[PDB]
Design a binder for this molecule. Sequence first.
Ligand SMILES: OC[C@H]1O[C@@H](O[C@H]2[C@H](O)[C@@H](O)[C@H](O)O[C@@H]2CO)[C@H](O)[C@@H](O)[C@@H]1O
Ligand SMILES: OC[C@H]1O[C@@H](O[C@H]2[C@H](O)[C@@H](O)[C@H](O)O[C@@H]2CO)[C@H](O)[C@@H](O)[C@@H]1O
Length: 377
Amino acid sequence: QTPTGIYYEVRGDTIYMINVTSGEETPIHLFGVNWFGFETPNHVVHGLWKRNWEDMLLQIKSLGFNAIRLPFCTESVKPGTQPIGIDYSKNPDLRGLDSLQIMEKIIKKAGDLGIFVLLDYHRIGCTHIEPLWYTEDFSEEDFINTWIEVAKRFGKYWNVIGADLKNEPHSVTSPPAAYTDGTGATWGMGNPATDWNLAAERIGKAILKVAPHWLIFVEGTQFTNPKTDSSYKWGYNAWWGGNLMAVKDYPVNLPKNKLVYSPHVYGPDVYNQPYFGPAKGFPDNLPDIWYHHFGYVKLELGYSVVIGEFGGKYGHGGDPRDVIWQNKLVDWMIENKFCDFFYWSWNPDSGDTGGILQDDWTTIWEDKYNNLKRLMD
Ligand SMILES: OC[C@H]1O[C@@H](O[C@H]2[C@H](O)[C@@H](O)[C@H](O)O[C@@H]2CO)[C@H](O)[C@@H](O)[C@@H]1O
Ligand SMILES: OC[C@H]1O[C@@H](O[C@H]2[C@H](O)[C@@H](O)[C@H](O)O[C@@H]2CO)[C@H](O)[C@@H](O)[C@@H]1O
């Protein structure tokens, strides 16, 4: 069932797109990039002070990408939010539009271009990623209603593939405090106040009632439960939204043809993890780490796994071990058939990662892009 005539589904570990009208059904790959801004105080994808928005989509497509993960915060999806930071001289057709109308116009155009869009509820406020899907201020019922409104509206755009429910569930205290103190996310504590896995079935089910044709992307948490995390030597060093160690014992209960697990994984430019020390075997030690944190969900359990974010400066003004890190991760994704992904970040204005575009928002980093395009063939 679909409002658009397009229906998305997971068969095995592959995402397929069905066109109910022509009857066509083919597998699809997501060669993606994150274009952020709508989750920030700008309330609009960044770079429009230097570039025309349509030209940005064209350039993304010209480099071989066919998907964009679009982070947003609650405010940006409500009528009337004023965007800041657009050169109207270069974006005349954006004059007087609110942030919601701009997102609509960008998604509709990405569709004309054949670019899939994944909506990512990145932040509840517009200043930082919260550890849970609700705050002292904003309830889980509010979070879900925001999603319901978003789905009823964007479910009408054919190229929107679904929802990444909440960006980077994580913790703000240490374990064992973390698994019960209630300030952070968990998985398999059988505690509805903090179990992201139980939460995902809830949020996701609500979205599917309104957008049955969508996919539901579920990220990992940071810590899961002490049994799971302690059962592995690097069980305490997974990235925010990057711990999927608990999926084995605590699957997320959503239909199997709609669920997509979506881990995040980063390099030394983001956090100097202990396993990045060469005396610890870096980078040759990574495959098994990636395998433990999330790889096995696809390789062993057979589920669709789409890396939601990964990136780094690739030696341009950052830690030179990041070049080796990105090279190895791409090698590993290719060998193991993790063909669907969203890089972080199309934007150059990411403090700890830089992005595909250089600082002038026009030219790209060639070496960084040449490594990544191995995955685009
Ligand atoms: O995951 C993105 C995020 O991680 C932050 O590092 C956490 C980290 O992910 C966790 O795996 C590791 O043990 O340490 C840190 C400390 O908070 C890093 O601070 C971020 O800026 C990056 O946003
Ligand atoms: O989002 C505004 C912004 O991008 C920031 O991204 C964090 C990101 O939102 C989170 O998903 C993950 O931890 O990665 C990046 C950085 O690792 C970026 O850090 C900012 O400098 C820029 O403010």
